[PDB]
Amino acid sequence: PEFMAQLYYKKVRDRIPLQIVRAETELSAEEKAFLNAVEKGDYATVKQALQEAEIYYNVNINCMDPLGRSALLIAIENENLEIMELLLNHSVYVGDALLYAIRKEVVGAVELLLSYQFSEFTPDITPIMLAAHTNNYEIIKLLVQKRVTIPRPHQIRCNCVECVSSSEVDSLRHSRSRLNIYKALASPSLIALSSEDPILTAFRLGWELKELSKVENEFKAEYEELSQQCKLFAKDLLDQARSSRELEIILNHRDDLAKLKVAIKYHQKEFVAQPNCQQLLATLWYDGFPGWRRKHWVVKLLTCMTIGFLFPMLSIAYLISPRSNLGLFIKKPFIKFICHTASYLTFLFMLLLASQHIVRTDLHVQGPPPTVVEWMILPWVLGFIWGEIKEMWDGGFTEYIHDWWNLMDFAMNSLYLATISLKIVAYVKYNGSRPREEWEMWHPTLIAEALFAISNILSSLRLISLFTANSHLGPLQISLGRMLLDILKFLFIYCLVLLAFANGLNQLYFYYETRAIDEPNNCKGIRCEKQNNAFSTLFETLQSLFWSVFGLLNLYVTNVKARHEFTEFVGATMFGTYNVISLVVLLNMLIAMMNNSYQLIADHADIEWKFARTKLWMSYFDEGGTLPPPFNIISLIQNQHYQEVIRNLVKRYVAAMIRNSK
Template sequence: TQALIEAEIYFKININCIDPLGRTALLIAIENENLELIELLLSYNVYVGDALLHAIRKEVVGAVELLLNHKKPSGEKQVPPILLDKQFSEFTPDITPIILAAHTNNYEIIKHLVQKGVSIPRPHEVRCNCVECVSGSDVDSLRHSRSRLNIYRALASPSLIALSSEDPFLTAFQLSWELQELSKVENEFKSEYEDLSKQCKQFAKDLLDQTRSSRELEIILNYRDDGGILEDQSGNDLARLKLAIKYHQKEFVAQPNCQQLLASRWYDEFPGWRRRHWAVKMVTCIIIGLLFPVFSACYLIAPKSNLGLFIRKPFIKFICHTASHLTFLFFLLRASQIGNKTKTDTEPNNIEWIILPWVLGIIWAEIKQMWDGGFQDYVHDWWNLMDFVMNALYLATISLKIVVYCKYRHEKATERHLWDTWHPTLVAEALFAIANIFSSLRLISLFTANSHLGPLQISLGRMLLDILKFLFIYCLVLLAFANGLNQLYFNYDTTNNTKNCTGIRCEIQNNAFSTLFETLQSLFWSIFGLINLYVTNVEPKHTFTSFVGATMFGTYNVISLVVLLNMLIAMMNNSYQLIADHADIEWKFARTKLWMSYFEEGGTLPTPFNIIPSPKSLWYLCKWVQKQICKKYTKQKPKSFGTLGRRAADNLRRHNQYQEVMRNLVKRYVAAMIRDAKTEEGLTEENFKELKQDISSFRFEVLGLLKGNKLKLQNAKMNNVSEEEEEKSKPKVNKSRTQKNTFSFFDITTMIHPKAGEIAADKHNNVSNGSALLASEASKEKPKKIQFAKDVKTFGLFHRHKTSNTEQSSSKIYSVSEEILEPEISSPTEKLLTSVKSQELTSELNVNKLEEQCIGTHGTMGTLECLSSEHSPSGYTSAKESPSDKVNHTLSTDLKSDMKSTPEEASTEEDTTTRL
C-alpha cells in the first residue's frame, strides 16, 4: 500500500487504468487468482465495479470473500468512462451476484452470499397482467423474457435450493412443474425450460438417494405440509409420494429406495413372494381369485375379522378386483353366444340379468372414485375417461332395453328383417357391442403390474397420442380431396340406374364419389387398397373428366400412403424408442400409480359386492342423517384441550423429525456433490494452493542446502588459519578473553540470520497458501520484547558490542520511515533493538553480505569451525539442517544466556567463552 501511495504521488500512476481488453488490475488479479494482489488493491480502495461478478464466474472463492468483506469508500474515485458504459459490461443489468452464483452452482459461493442475507425475488406468473409485467414486456419483450429465464435458471440451482429452502422436496416439485408449464407457454425457450425442469426432478431424486434407513424414508414420504398443527393428520398415508405423482416426478417415484418401500407394503402378507417359484405364484393367485366371493362376504358380515382384514391388503385387493373383472368379461362373452333373437323380445335373458349388477357396481365405483379424488384428478387419467365412455354406453344400452320393454311389450313379435333401421333393439345391440370392446381393452391397464407387459402397455398409450396427431393432419387432407372429387363426380350419379346395390361395398363398386359421405368412405378405404381404379370412370365417354379424376385420386394415394402413413410409422417408432430408453422409469411410475390406487382405504369390495350396503356403511349413514336432522337442536361439543394438545404435539413431533431428516439429507447431498465435483474436475483451486506451497517449501530447502555448502567450503579454507591462531593464543589467556568480547557482535548477527530466514519462510508460506483471509495468526504476531535487568553490569555485553559495531553501523541503509524514527532512540537498549529489527528486515536481500561480515569479524571463523565440529562430530549434516543452522542455534542460545545472566554469573560466562 505504501508503495502504491508513493507511486501515485511521485509518478502519478492511475491504479484504475485498463488494458486494451478493458480489464483493470483487479480483474486481471482475479483471473490469475492472485489473492494477495487482490487484497492489496482493495486496501488501496481500487474501483471494484463488476469484480465480484467476475470472481463468481471464475469461481474464485477467496476473491469472493475478499470482495464481500471489502467496504467501499465513502468518497468517489475517478472511474474510467468505459467502465460506466452498460454496453461494455459483460453482464446484463438483471444479473446479480446471487443469480450468477446460482448459475455456476458453486456451493461455497452461494453459502457466503446466503449468509449475507441475499435472496432472489420470485418472478411473476407468465400470464400475469400486472402493470410491471405489461410495461416490461411492452418496453423490451426480449429483455423481459431473458430476465425471467435467468431468474428461473438461478432458482433451479440445486445448491441454492439446498441452502435456502426449508423443504427442498416441495420446492423442487413445484418449481419443476412451473417450469414445465412455462415451456408450453414460451415456445421460444422451450428447451431451456425443459432442461431446468429435468434438473429440478433430478435434484429431488438425488436428495432422496441419501436416505439410509426405512425410518428416514417413511418420515419423508409420509410428511404432510398442507394441514394445520391442530388438524388430525394420518402418519402413514404416503402424502409426499402422492404429491410427487401429482407433479409427475417420475425420477423421484422410480427411485430404488422409494420402490423398495412400496414393494414391502404391497406384498405385506407375502414377505417372500418374489423369491417363490412362478408356478407357486400362479396357483396362489388362482386360489385367491376363486375365493373372492367368500372374502367379500366375510368383509360384509365381519369387517374386523381375519378374513375381513385379509381382503383389505393391497395385493389381495388387487387379485380380487382382477378376478371380478375377468368374471365380468366371461359373462359378456357368454351373452353373445346364448340366444338367437329373430323376433322382438322385450324381456332380458338370465345372462343379461347377471351382467346388470356388474355394470351397476362399475358405475358406483367410478362415482365414488370421482367423489374421493376430485373431478380434476379423475379426468387427468385416460383410463378413467375410457371407463366413463364405457359406462355411458352401458347406461344407454340399459335405457334402450327399458324403452323396448315399455313400447313393444304389448305388441306382437315381428321378424328381425322387418325391423326399422333405428329400432331400439338394434341400437342397443350396437352400443352394447362397443361397450364390450372397451370392457375388454380395460384389462390392458392391469398389465402395468407386470415387468414384461408394463413397458409395452405404456408404449401403446404413447402411440395412441401419435395416432391422434396423425389423424388431425390426415382428416384435413381427406376432406380436401373429398371435396374436390365430389365436385367433379356428383353430376354423374347413377343411383337410379342401379337397382341392386349402390356404393363401394357392392360387388361391382359404383357411385364412389357421388356424395360427400360416400367420397369420404371411398378415400378412407383406398388406403388399404380396397378401391379399384375404375371407379374414376364415367358412363359418358368424357375422357378429360376421367383423367382429371384419376389424377386427383392418384395424388391423394401418394400423399396419404407415401407421406402421411410413413410419417405416422416414424412417429410411432420414435415414441416407442423414447419409452424403451426410459422403460424402467416409465414403468415404475405407472406401476406406482396403480399400487397407490389400492393403498387407499376405500374401495375394498370388488364388483358386484360393492353395491351391497354393509353394516358399517349403514351405521355411517345413520350417523350422518342424525347429524343433519339434529344439527339445529344440538350444539357441537368443543374438543377438549387434552385432545388438541396431543394432536398438536404429534404434528409438531412429525414436523421436527422431518426437519431433522432433511438437514441430514442436505449435508450428505452437499458432501457427495463436492466429492463428485472434485472427482470430475481433477485439479481444483485447493490443489493449486497445495502445489504452490510445496514448490515454495522445496525452494527454501534448496536455498538452505546451498547456503550450508557455501559455509562448509569457507570453513575448510579457514581451518588451517584458525588452528595456527589457537596455538599462538594458548599462552595468552587475556587475549582470548578479549576475543570473547569481540565475539558478541557475531552472536547477535548469527541470531538475526536464522530469525530473518524463518520470517521470510513464514511470509512466503502465507503468500503461497492462496488465501490472504485465511493466513495464520502466527505470521501476524509482533516480535516479543526482551526484558533487560536494570543493573549496569547487565548492559556490559552491549557496551562491549558498541566499540566493535561502530564501523558497520555507519554503512547501513535506512528506509524513509526508519530515518525518521532513528533520532528518537536514545538509550543503548533501544539502539540495539533497532539494529536487530533493521537486520531482520534486510536479511532476505543481504544474506550473502551478512555471511561475509560474520566470517570476517575479528577472525571468528575459527570459533565457527569449532562450534560446527562440536555439534556434528562426524562432519556430516543432513539436507534438512545445515551446519550454519546448527551454529546459529548455538550462538543464539549463548546470546540469550548473556542477556539473562546476573552480575554474580559474569565470571562463569567468561570461563565458558574461553572454553569456546
C-alpha cells in the first residue's frame, strides 16, 4: 500500500502515532489544585494554600498554567475581586495583569490593579494604548486621570536616527508599534476625552492615516479602517448638534464656515455631506430664494432663465454701484452661479455662431481679419485667461493642479492663446488672397482654425462640471469620473496590445508601401475611398488598428498588389488576432471592470456627489470672482462658545455610544 508518509513527522507504517511534540513542563498536583481553587472561587482554599506557601517553598506563588494564564489572570477572567485582592496582598506576580483586565473591560478589576513569560499582548502595548483599542470610555478615563502618555509618532517620511535604526534592526516590531500608536490615537473615546478640538483632531488624524495607508503599502487596510473610524467619529459628533446655533458655532470656528473649509481640505466627505451641514449650506446658497425648495419646477425654470437672460444687467449693476439694491444681487451665490452659467452659455452660443455663415469672410483670404463673432468671442477668452491666472495666484499651483477641470481650462486657454497668436501671425505675414487649395500644409490660418476647433470642443465639454449642481446629473458625473480611472488602466493595456500588433503588421507590410501617385485618386492611407497602405508605416498602422476597433478599416487593406497569398494570410491573421484580443477580450475587460467599479461607486455616490456639490457651492460664496467673463476684466469668546458646544456634543456622543453598546 502506497501511504502518505511524513505528514506530521520527519521519520520515514499504516498509522500516524500522535504525541505531544512541543511538550511543556506541567505543574504539580498541588499547583493544579491551586489553579483549580482560583478558577472555582474557593476563597478559603486559595487563602490557605498561599498562606502555607508563604512558610515553605513547596508551592509556587507565580505558578503559570500551560495555557499561559497564572492564578491572577484566572481571577481576572472570572471577575473575582476578592481573590484578586488576596493574591495581590501576598505578592503575586502582577506582570501584564492590567492589560488582561483592560481587554476584559471590567472597571472594578482595572481599578483594583491600578491601586495594587508568555503574554497575549505584544511588548509595545501599554495600558492606555490597549484601553484606547477597546474604546471603553470608563477605562480610558480611569487611565487618563492617573496622568499617562502615548509616544508621539513620527512624520510619515522621517529619516532620523531612531527611525532608520528601529526599522533596520526590527521592522516588524516598528511597524506594529506605529500601527498600535495610531490605533490608540484614532480612538473616538480618547479623542473625545483628551483632545482640545475633537473635530479638528479627527480631521487631521483621518488625513494622516489615509496618507499612511498610501505609504504603508502593507497594512493598508488597517490604516484605512482607522481613517474611516476618525471620519465617522467627526461626522457622529456633528450628528449630535441639536440647534442651528450649535451647528453654526462648530462650522464657523477658526483656530464664514472655516471649519467646513478645513473639512473640505481634509476630504472629510461624510462630515460635509451630513444633512444639517448640507441644510445650512443650502440656506446660504439660496440666499435670495427662501422658498426655493417649495417651488414648482416651471417656476424655477422661469426664474433661472430670467436671471440668466439678465446676467449682463446684473454684472453692469454690480460694476456701476456694488452697494445697491441691484449691485449686490449678483453677490448671492445662486444668482452668481446662474449669471456665470449664462455667461458661459452665451460664449458657447457664439462659438457655435462662429462656424455658421451669418457673417463670414472669404475662405480664400490667407490671414483674414477677425469676424465680428470672433471679435465678440475675444472678451470671454481674455476673461477666462484672467480668471484662471487670478485663481492660480490666489491658490498656488499645488491647489491649481489638484483640480482636473482646472487642467482642462489650462488646455483650453493655451489653445485659445495659440489661436490668437496664429491669427496675428497669419494677418501680419500674409496679404494676398491665394486660393485655399493652394495653401501649404502648415499654413498658420489652417493651424489656427484647427486649434480653434479643438478649443471649441474643450469649451463645450467644460459644461459637464455644472452637472455637480444637479440632483440627477451630479451622481452621474461622479460615477463617470470615477470609472475614468479604470478606463485609463485599460487604456494602458490596450495601448500595449496596439503597439505589439502595430509592430507586427508594419514589419510585415512595410515592403509593399505603394507611392501615393500609384493609388486610384492620388490618395494614400485609410482615409480614402479605396483604403490602402494601412500597415505601410508605423503611424498609419497605429491609426488603422485604432479604426479597426470601430469597424472602419475594411478587410481588403490586408491584401498586397503583388498578391503574396501567404503574406496576405499572415497579415489577415494578425489583424484577426488583434480584433479578437481587443474587441472581444479587452473591451469586455472594460465592461466587467466598469460594472465592478460602478457597484463600488453606487455604494457611496450620494456622499461623493454632495461633497463635490459643496465644493462647487463654496466656490461661489467668496467675493473674489463675482463678475463672470467678460465683465471680470473691467476671538477668545469664540473659542469659549466652541468649547461649550464641543462639551455638549461629546457628552451626547459618549452617551449615545454607551447605549449603542447595550
